[PDB]
Amino acid sequence: MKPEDVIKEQCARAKVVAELWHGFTGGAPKAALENLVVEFNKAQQGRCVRPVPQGGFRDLSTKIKAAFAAGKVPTMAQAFENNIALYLEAKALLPIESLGVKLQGVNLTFLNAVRFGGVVYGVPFNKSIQVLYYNKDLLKKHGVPVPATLEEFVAAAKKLSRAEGGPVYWFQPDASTFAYFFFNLGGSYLKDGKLVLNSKEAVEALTLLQNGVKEGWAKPITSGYINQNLGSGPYAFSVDTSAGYTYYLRAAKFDLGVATLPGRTKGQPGYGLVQGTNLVVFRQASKEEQAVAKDFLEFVLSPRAQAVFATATGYVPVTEGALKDPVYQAYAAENPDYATIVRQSRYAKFEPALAEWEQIRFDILGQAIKEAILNKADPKAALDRAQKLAEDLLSSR
Ligand SMILES: Nc1nc2c(ncn2[C@@H]2O[C@H](COP(=O)(O)O[C@H]3[C@@H](O)[C@H](n4ccc(=O)[nH]c4=O)O[C@@H]3CO)[C@H]3CC(O)(O)C[C@H]32)c(=O)[nH]1
Secondary structure, three states, X not given: OOHHHHHHHHHHHOOEXXXXXXXXXXXXXXXXXXXXXXXXXXXXXXXXXXXXXOOOHHHHHHHHHHHXXXXXXXXXXXXXXXXXXXXXXXXXXXXXXXXXXXXXXXXXXXXXXXXXXXXXXXXXEEEEEEEEEXXXXXXXXXXXXXXXXXXXXXXXXXXXXXXXXXXXXXXXXXXXXXXXXXXXXXXXXXXXXXXXXXXXXXXXXXXXXXXXXXXXXXXXXXXXXXXXXXXXXOOOEEEEEHHHHHHHHHHOOOOEEEEOOXXXXXXXXXXXXXXEEEEEEEOOOOHHHHHHHHHHHHHHXXXXXXXXXXXXXXXEOOEOHHHHOHHHHHHHXXXXXXXXXXXXXXXXXXXXXXXXXXXXXXXXXXXXXXXXHHHOOOHHHHHHHHHHHHHHXXXXX
């Protein structure tokens, strides 16, 4: 039986059912969430959670806005920080601490990100960090150390591309990959409270990617995830979410490595972009559904739930107690990549938490990155257009 069939039967027999809308489309993340819910539902007498897949994360936020418009919302949903900011304009969210959920021990990197006007409105659940995936076999073949600095990284990609006859640094031309390069060239998105997409560091980061394509060391991936394109052409490296860990492990026909990100200098790893989502609880839920949500959120933050979830997926454990749990410890003792993901989670940056950020990161900035990389648009001209389109949107609403 599929975990979802088990959940269907649990919920059919329950007196109260709290809907949880999510953007996991399959693989380990969907299975780990479903397994967690099956175990929680077994503990409860006539009280259950029903996970409902809404497609991916942007399908989820579109369907959540339409749910408001149709007058009928789930009890819980996954949300990015910028989605929480949007739902707060409508005052749609219950303060988490009012519900009774204890948040002491939640990483302050994650807890700070869910706190708005001093109030926590999300529970960090599935938080990822960017890591360096590499081909251990291909680096060994050419005597190339794992690069520790941006300078070393560019040098390695050129040395390995020339030897193997193809570009070996694989990337999606998207806001997530852009953020890695932007952040570690000294970039910041807010200057004196204003959103700035066309700063010198943004032009420098996009120009670096464009030059990498022209010089033959950077390969744009335009169809599917990087881990869905492995096997065609030489691969050395990618900068990608920790949540891609199980997908790379199943796809790679080589010895997969995971390292901390190249930084400006060897004094510190590079900053990784934090992705994945928080759980939120909707005000429109009944008292009884909100009690299920409270018990569910406390279960999700328990050291065992966090240990099983993060080791099944490559998401970062969100509590200090998860790291003390023997299941976590047994996994980490067999697999150094779990400690590498935790160490990289210490060097973590977020994108702006503006209500408009979902639309800006995909339709405005994402599109300028694609114009520059796929159609050789001038990076400054592409980003100047992105700045005007973003200013017009913010001024709009
Ligand atoms: N809607 C909305 N999206 C946002 C926002 N900020 C960032 N992002 C998106 O979050 C994804 C990162 O989230 P994360 O939980 O770390 O990783 C996801 C998947 O990315 C990754 N995955 C899935 C299948 C696969 O074959 N390989 C694989 O790696 O696994 C996880 C669960 O599906 C990025 C990826 C994107 O969806 O393509 C665009 C980015 C925002 O503000 N709004």
